[PDB]
């Protein structure tokens, strides 16, 4: 909504090679701030953003205990699911979980999430009401009944309405100067001749934060929808993102084309042209 916090988790069984590998990372908006990898020497949750490092030793200890506890629960859950789906112990399997909260500018919960997937397909998810479940097949329906009986939705709901939101606002204030500042895209158009008769115009949006952005190409003000090649937004590797859009045009027609950029870091949507 206005801001968000998310935790991602992946356990992968490794039959004939070792205990399942467990990896989890947390984000506030599009900023990574913590990671835990069970394959790390003496595994501990570690800081990955500047503003979280001020948390004290009890924070790092409790977060590490939660991670090792989730790594164990997933191992058991991997065993359970082999039974629910009647699979062999010799095959590798993946369990994924994402939960977190979005808050509005009031700083209250807008939406909470808690969902899981087995082997890359939906398994069971907490609905928006933070009260009922959507199970994706009959094995997940076993889980659903057990989780209804054990009143699990209620515990997650208390967390997502409380602790989730409270520490997000904490992270937002402590990391205010980076997380509450939108970095607008640096834009420009390049021109790449294909032959003597045609060329590609590529509209670049670089160094921006957050990741969300709209890039479009228009010819004499009309949208070149089915003709633009639009790559997926990608990390520059310095916590900002990059994106480009391209269109191939007839030589001599270049100046009829316009690139239009929307990003919340921009006061108004940009229009740019190749300035030869």
């Amino acid at each position: 909504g206005s801001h968000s916090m998310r935790y991602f988790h992946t356990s992968v069984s490794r039959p004939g090679r070792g205990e399942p590998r467990f990896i989890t990372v947390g984000y506030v908006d599009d900023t990574l701030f913590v990671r835990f990898d069970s394959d790390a020497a003496s595994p501990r949750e570690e800081p990955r953003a500047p503003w979280i490092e001020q948390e004290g030793p009890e924070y790092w200890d409790r977060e590490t205990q939660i991670c090792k506890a989730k790594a164990q629960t997933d191992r058991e859950d991997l065993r359970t699911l082999l039974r629910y789906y009647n699979q062999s112990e010799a095959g590798s399997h993946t369990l994924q979980n994402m939960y977190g909260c979005d808050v509005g500018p009031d700083g209250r919960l807008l939406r909470g999430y808690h969902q899981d997937a087995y082997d890359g397909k939906d398994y069971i998810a907490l609905n928006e009401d933070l009260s009922s479940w959507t199970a994706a097949d009959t094995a997940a329906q076993i889980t659903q009944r057990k989780w209804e009986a054990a009143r699990v939705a209620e515990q997650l709901r208390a967390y997502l309405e409380g602790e989730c939101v409270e520490w997000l606002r904490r992270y937002l204030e402590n990391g205010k100067e980076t997380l509450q500042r939108a970095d607008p895209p640096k834009t420009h158009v390049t021109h790449h001749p294909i032959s003597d008769h045609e060329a590609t115009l590529r509209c670049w949006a670089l160094g921006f934060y957050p990741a969300e952005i709209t890039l479009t190409w228009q010819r004499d003000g009309e949208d070149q929808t089915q003709d633009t090649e639009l790559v997926e937004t990608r990390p520059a590797g310095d916590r900002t993102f990059q994106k480009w859009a391209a269109v191939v045009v007839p030589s001599g027609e270049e100046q009829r084309y316009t690139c239009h950029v929307q990003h919340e870091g921009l006061p108004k949507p940009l229009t740019l042209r190749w300035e030869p």
């Binding site: 991602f8 992946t10 992968v12 990896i23 990372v25 984000y27 990574l32 990671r35 990898d37 590798s92 993946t94 994924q96 994402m98 997937a117 082997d119 890359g120 397909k121 939906d122 390049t190 790449h192 590529r202 670089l206 790559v231 997926e232 990608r234 990390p235 520059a236 590797g237 310095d238 990059q242 480009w244």
Partner: protein, 99 residues
């Protein structure tokens, strides 16, 4: 389900021959997570390469950034090589400074 990786090879800053920069290989949309990625210079595997920790998108497919510091020249050829269960042979995507 299994999904083949999308791959983008690109630098942190606009390439300027002689100027230090970072070579990035971003792999996304894949499943399972097990993947092998190398950054190649003139066909040879660059040895000290870093990567983010495994994360995934709303549709559960994985993404990973791999990167290394480099100084582009006119001559040196750079590429990213990806191996994954969906690929019968490794995919080599060449770095184009225009992309």
């Amino acid at each position: 389900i299994q999904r083949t990786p999308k791959i983008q090879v690109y630098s942190r800053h606009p390439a300027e021959n002689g100027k230090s920069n970072f070579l990035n290989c971003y792999v996304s949309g894949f499943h399972p997570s097990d993947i092998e990625v190398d950054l190649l210079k003139n066909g040879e595997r660059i040895e000290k390469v870093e990567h983010s920790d495994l994360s995934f998108s709303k549709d559960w497919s994985f993404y990973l950034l791999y990167y290394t510091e480099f100084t582009p020249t006119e001559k040196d050829e750079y590429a990213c090589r990806v191996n994954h269960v969906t690929l019968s042979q490794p995919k080599i995507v060449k770095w184009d400074r225009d992309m």
